[PDB]
Amino acid sequence: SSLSIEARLESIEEKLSMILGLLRTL
Amino acid sequence: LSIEARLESIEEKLSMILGLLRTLN
Amino acid sequence: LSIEARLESIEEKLSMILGLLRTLN
């Protein structure tokens, strides 16, 4: 926390992309 | 690179994950 | 339309994913 909304959101999005990449291998 | 643009993309990803998960064997 | 509206929707999707992920185990 204390990283701002813009930077905090970047990570959420990059974490979701990882999950999608991993899921698409099934 | 906009809060609105970033959020839309996030929403898309979540729905995609849900769609992929519903089909999970 | 509106950050708060999307954020609520995003939160709802995350909860759904959690339930499913817990269900798969």
Next chain:
Amino acid sequence: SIEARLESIEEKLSMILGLLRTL
């Protein structure tokens, strides 16, 4: 509450991540 929403979202993500590893 926005700053509060993000914290809640961030916490759901952690569980999801952990659960993926449990797969």
